[PDB]
């Protein structure tokens with residue numbers, strides 16, 4: 001089972017991992033049944 | 049196949065359903081009942 005917990009918060013910082021406390025609520029529990037050992041992120045870029 | 053086919057030669061549709069298990073994803077209907085309150089009741093809520 002692939003479990004994803006999530007949380008969203010409004011902040012007004014410039015560069016830091018803000019302190020404080022915030023418990024993440026479960027978002028989804030997908031029945032995938034695969035072997036995960038590596039992962040990567042996907043960003044967006046601007047063009048014109 | 050023709051409309052006047054015999055019973056043996058008449059067309060037949062066949063579907064074979066094979067169940068593969070090795071987290072199970074497709075389960076049974078899991079019927080339910082009505083809710084009663086204010087009585088000593090044996091209850092089952094999602095296991």
Ligand SMILES: *[C@@H]1O[C@H](CO)[C@@H](O[C@@H]2O[C@H](CO)[C@@H](O)[C@H](O)[C@H]2NC(C)=O)[C@H](O)[C@H]1NC(C)=O
Pocket residue numbers: 035036037
């Ligand atoms: C998930 O896949 C990885 C593949 O990198 C497995 O890691 C290998 O597992 C085999 C056993 O089958 C070992 O012989 C290798 O030495 C392992 N390689 C590394 C880099 O660790 C991992 O075992 C798999 N996970 C599960 C639960 O099977």
